[PDB]
Amino acid sequence: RIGEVASRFGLPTRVLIEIVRTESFQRSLARVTSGKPVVLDLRELDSDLASWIATHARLVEPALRELVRTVAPDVEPRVRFRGLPHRFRRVERIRPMDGALISIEGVVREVRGAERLEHAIVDTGSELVAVRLHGHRLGPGLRVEILGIVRSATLDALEVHKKDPIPEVHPDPAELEEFRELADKDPLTTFARAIAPLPGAEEVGKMLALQLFSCVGKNSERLHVLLAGYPVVCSEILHHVLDHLAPRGVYVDLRRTELTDLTAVLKEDRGWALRAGAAVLADGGILAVDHLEGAPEPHRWALMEAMDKGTVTVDGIALNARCAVLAAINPGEPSDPPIARIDLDQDFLSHFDLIAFLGVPSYTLLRRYLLYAIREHPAPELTEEARKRLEHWYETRREEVEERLGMGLPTLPVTRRQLESVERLAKAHARMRLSDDVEPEDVDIAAELVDWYLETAMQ
C-alpha cells in the first residue's frame, strides 16, 4: 500500500502516488527481475514536484527501494533517476546540497579501495568532491558526469557517465556564424597573435596555435613544442596558453615536481589509493612543463612515454596521458648554434616536433572555437594532392641536407620524425579551418614551420 509506505518514510502520499503513476516507473518496475534498476524520469512529473523530489532524494530513494523490495524480495533493489531539473546538474558546490539528488562533472583526481574500487575524489572546477562509488567504475584522469545523492559532503554515486576529455561546446546559430566567419579568415594569424603578440614572435605564435589544435585523443596527432628562451617570457607564455586558451591542461615547474607528481602515485595502506599526477590530469589538453633544464632521467622517461604513447605507467598500471607537451628551457651564453646551447640529451630532444628559439577577438570565442574544432574535426586526412605535396617537401629537403653535408655545412637531418611533424601540423591547421580534408595549403604552412625550426636551430 502506497500510503503506508509514504507515511513510513515521511513523504506526502501524493509524492509516491504520482511517482508510481509515471510511465518510466511502471515499465521498469515490470522489468525488475531482469536485474534492471527501477527508473524515475522526473520530466514525467510536475516541475515543482520534480524539484521537490530532487531536493529530498535522501527520503524518496529508500521509499522507492522499499516499494521495489515488495515486488522483488529476490534481487538487490536499485533505483535510478533521470531528467534532473537543470539547477541540480553540474553542481559547483555540493555541501549546501546535502540530502539532494545532483550531478557533478569533472576530472577524477584519485581513486581508492581494497578488494573493490570504493572511493574517488573529483575536481569539478572550483572544488574537490569526495565520492562513494558503490560498485561504479572510473579511474584517475577520466572526465565523468556522476549522478548521486549528497550525504555529509560526500556524493553517493548512483551512476557514472564517461565523458570526452574536453568540455563540449554546442554553439547557437549566432555563435556558429562567428565560428564560420573565423574559419573563412586567417584563424592561424589570429590565434598566433593572441598567444604571442610581441615583435618577432610570429613563428612561435603559429607553432603554439597549431599545437592547441592538435589536442586530440588519437595518439599520433598531438604536437610537442619546446620553447627555448629567457625564464620570465617563457613562463608568461606557458601560463597564458593554459589560462586563456587551452581546452584542458596543467602547469608544472619541473624543478618543483616529484616524479609521482608528474605521473601518478600508488600508495599501499590497509588498501590502495591511486592519485593522478600532472600528465594524467592534462589528458586531452596541454601539459605545460616549465624549466626543463637538467630534467632528471626518470622525469625524461615519463615525459617520453606521455609524448610517444600518450600514457604514464606506475607499477604496471597504464593511465591515459594524451597531452600535448609545451615545455620551456632556459639555455644561455657559447657561439655555438642555438640547438647546441640546449643542455638536454639528443634522444629526449628529438621527441619534440618543434623547438621555438625565442629572439631567433575575445578569448571566450577563441577557446570555444578551439573546443568546437577539436570535437568536430578529430581526424582530418590528407587529400591526394596534399599527400603529394608532403612527399615532395620531404624528398626535396632530404636531398638538400645530403647536398649541404656534402659541402661541409653542419645541418640537422630531415628524418621520418620531421615528416611526421609536418603531417601533424598540417592536420592541426585543417582543424583550424574546421575541415576534415588536409590540403596542400595546410602542408605548406606546416612545412614552413618545420623548416624555420630546422634552420634557426643551426643559424
* Domain residue ranges of the chain, discontinuous segments joined by +: 1-84, 85-164, 171-459
Fold assignment, 171-459: Rossmann fold (3.40.50)
Q: Which amino acid is at 239?
A: H
| Alpha carbon distance 112, 271 (integer Å) | 8
**What cell numbers appear for 318 in the block?**
597504464
Place of cell 515543482: 48
Q: Which residues pair with 79 in a beta bridge?
A: 38
Enumerate the H helices of 344-415 as residue ranges.
Answer: 346-349, 363-376, 384-406
**What cell numbers appear for 437 in the block?**
580534408
149: CB partners within 8 A, 6+ apart? 57, 58, 61, 99, 100, 101, 102, 155, 156, 158
CATH number of 1-84: 1.10.260.200
**What cell numbers appear for 444 in the block?**
605548406
CATH class of 85-164: mainly beta
Q: What technique was this entry resolved by?
A: X-ray
* φ, ψ (nearest 5 deg) of residue 296: -65, 150
Residue 387 CB burial class (10 angstroms; 0-12, 13-18, ≥19): middle
Residue 408 CB burial class (10 angstroms; 0-12, 13-18, ≥19): exposed
Q: How far is CA 254 from the centre of its chain?
A: 20
The three-class DSSP label of residue 152 is coil
